[PDB]
Write a protein that binds this ligand. Structure first.
Ligand SMILES: CC(C)CCC[C@@H](C)[C@H]1CC[C@H]2[C@@H]3CC=C4C[C@@H](O)CC[C@]4(C)[C@H]3CC[C@]12C
Ligand SMILES: CC(C)CCC[C@@H](C)[C@H]1CC[C@H]2[C@@H]3CC=C4C[C@@H](O)CC[C@]4(C)[C@H]3CC[C@]12C
Ligand SMILES: CC(C)CCC[C@@H](C)[C@H]1CC[C@H]2[C@@H]3CC=C4C[C@@H](O)CC[C@]4(C)[C@H]3CC[C@]12C
Ligand SMILES: COc1ccccc1CCCN1CC[C@H]2[C@@H](C1)c1cccc3c1N2CCN3C
Ligand SMILES: CCCCCCCC/C=C\CCCCCCCC(=O)OC[C@H](O)CO
Ligand SMILES: CCCCCCCC/C=C\CCCCCCCC(=O)OC[C@H](O)CO
Ligand SMILES: CCCCCCCC/C=C\CCCCCCCC(=O)OC[C@H](O)CO
Ligand SMILES: CCCCCCCC/C=C\CCCCCCCC(=O)OC[C@H](O)CO
Ligand SMILES: CCCCCCCC/C=C\CCCCCCCC(=O)OC[C@H](O)CO
Ligand SMILES: CCCCCCCC/C=C\CCCCCCCC(=O)OC[C@H](O)CO
Ligand SMILES: [Mg+2]
Length: 358
């Protein structure tokens, strides 16, 4: 029965922060026009997953702490509760994989509908992957009950579920995240190199005596312009003057290029610094999810490995606490957004003040 547990107070705090914080994310992305990009649409869908886990899954997990982990509800609600908990968590890990993969492809290939199609793809994969839990668990209580505790009792569901639904999207997430960091370092390197070629050839053109030196340096500025359209024509115009022997006039046009170079370099240069700042925030989201679920995932796999060897009473007691470190991850993504994005922080600040006009 009640059993007077004190855990309820702590668990309720986690539930409220989860619900309130993730509502603030869904409100920020629905309302604030500066957050209408594909990454932030994935972060809204991830917040729905986190909100639904706070509403449907977490109160029932608190409820079972209050009955000594004797399952208080009707018995066929056990497999439905486990299904939802695995679904919302599987959908969290395939979303973070999807962001990581989509940001990587978006560098190499330079729509709201396209994002929504991928979001719905991620949910449909999560609903399908998690589907053996109620299909087999509702026909056999031995798979979802252990000593009248509702938990995923089938060892083979836990191994193959952990590998297929939690290890392979973790693998893809960590590879595409590392390759994204290498991509943006190469892009900032290539733009330092193009800046050096433009700046060296401006100094050659201003020292120049003859039409050969200006035509040589403007041709090499054109090649360097072709790595980072407006300048290419502006270069060609000066090249034509140099071709007809108008050296001084071509030199005048090169200083006219200088103003356009300072403009286009710093614009491309500030867009790389934005992407790397954004990658770092997503990396903290990614880092916290792996770390806060790590004690539960490995213990649950170590339970299966030392099945008769280990104190399964102790193991089960750790899994009951380690599931709450992972539930606490639902509360942190909104905080991360406040700490590292002015747009979220200001949006949240306004919504707490009940003020919804952008
Ligand atoms: C990529 C495809 C992967 C994720 C899919 C494609 C085919 C799938 C397998 C098809 C059938 C079986 C047999 C069943 O008894 C356990 C799951 C298992 C072993 C599946 C695991 C996941 C699987 C390997
Ligand atoms: C990181 C994961 C850490 C926190 C987890 C993952 C594996 C876990 C261990 C797995 C198995 C056992 C044996 C059991 O008889 C006591 C707990 C103990 C020793 C666990 C302690 C916590 C543990 C080390
Ligand atoms: C309960 C727990 C968390 C609460 C929410 C927390 C924050 C906000 C944002 C605010 O702007 C309107 C109320 C609203 C949406 C609350 C509604 C009631 C609520 C859902
Ligand atoms: C990335 O996230 C993960 C990584 C690996 C595995 C799972 C997740 C998130 C899903 C967490 N849920 C929590 C509710 C259920 C269920 C797992 C489960 C299976 C076996 C034993 C369980 C439980 N709990 C209840 C306590 N015990 C003893
Ligand atoms: C943001 C845009 C769309 C997100 C869609 C969110 C929809 C997810 C709600 C959860 C859901 O569809 O549940 C599966 C179903 O209960 C299985 O039986
Ligand atoms: C960190 C976030 C939440 C705290 C979660 C605390 C979970 C505490 C677990 C309580 C427990 O295992 O209680 C056993 C019960 O008392 C047997 O009768
Ligand atoms: C997703 C599968 C949904 C399956 C729905 C199962 C419903 C279980 C249920 O509510 O039954 C409890 C009890 O047997 C009577 O109240
Ligand atoms: C998850 C991807 C695979 C989903 C399809 C897996 C169906 C097979 C299965 O779940 O086998 C249960 C069997 O009754 C023995 O426990
Ligand atoms: C025989 C087992 C068939 C394996 C079928 C895998 C389904 C299990 C699953 O999809 O989820 C389990 C959960 O994610 C784990 O924590
Ligand atoms: C990372 C931590 C590694 C160190 C832990 C290794 C666990 C097994 C060895 C000694 C028990 C140490 C006490 C802590 C765990 C309690 C296990 C226990 O009490 O096991 C007795 C039971 O009767 C058996 O079936
Ligand atoms: Mg140089």
């Amino acid at each position: 029965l009640q059993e007077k547990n004190w855990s309820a107070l702590l668990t309720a705090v986690v539930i409220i922060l989860t619900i309130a914080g993730n509502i603030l994310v869904i409100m920020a992305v629905s309302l604030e026009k500066k957050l209408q990009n594909a990454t932030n649409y994935f972060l809204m869908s991830l917040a729905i997953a986190d909100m639904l886990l706070g509403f449907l899954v977490m109160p029932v997990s608190m409820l079972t702490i209050l009955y000594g982990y004797r399952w208080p509800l009707p018995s066929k609600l056990c497999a439905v509760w486990i299904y939802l908990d695995v679904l919302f968590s599987t959908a969290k890990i395939w979303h973070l994989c999807a962001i990581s993969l989509d940001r990587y492809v978006a560098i190499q290939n330079p729509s709201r509908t396209k994002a929504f199609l991928k979001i719905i793809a991620v949910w449909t994969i999560s609903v399908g992957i998690s589907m053996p839990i109620p299909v087999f668990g509702l026909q056999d209580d031995s798979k979802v009950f252990k000593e009248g505790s509702c938990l995923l009792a089938d060892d083979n569901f836990v191994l193959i579920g952990s590998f297929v639904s939690f290890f392979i999207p973790l693998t893809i997430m960590v590879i595409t995240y590392f390759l994204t960091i290498k991509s943006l370092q190469k892009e900032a390197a290539d733009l330092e190199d193009n800046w050096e070629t433009l700046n060296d050839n401006l100094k050659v053109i201003e020292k120049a005596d003859n039409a050969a030196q200006v035509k040589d340096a403007l041709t090499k500025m054109r090649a360097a312009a072709l790595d980072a359209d407006i300048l290419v024509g502006q270069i060609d115009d000066a090249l034509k003057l140099a071709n007809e022997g108008k050296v001084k006039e071509a030199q005048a046009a090169a200083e006219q290029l200088k103003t356009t170079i300072n403009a286009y370099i710093q614009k491309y240069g500030q867009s790389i610094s934005n992407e790397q700042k954004a990658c770092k925030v997503l990396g903290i989201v990614f880092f916290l999810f792996v770390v806060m679920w790590c004690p539960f995932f490995i213990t649950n796999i170590m339970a299966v490995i030392c099945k008769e060897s280990c104190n399964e009473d102790v193991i089960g007691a750790l899994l009951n606490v380690f599931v709450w470190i992972g539930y606490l991850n639902s509360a942190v993504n909104p905080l991360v957004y406040t700490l590292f994005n002015k747009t979220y922080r200001s949006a949240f600040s306004r919504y707490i003040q009940c003020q919804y006009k952008e």
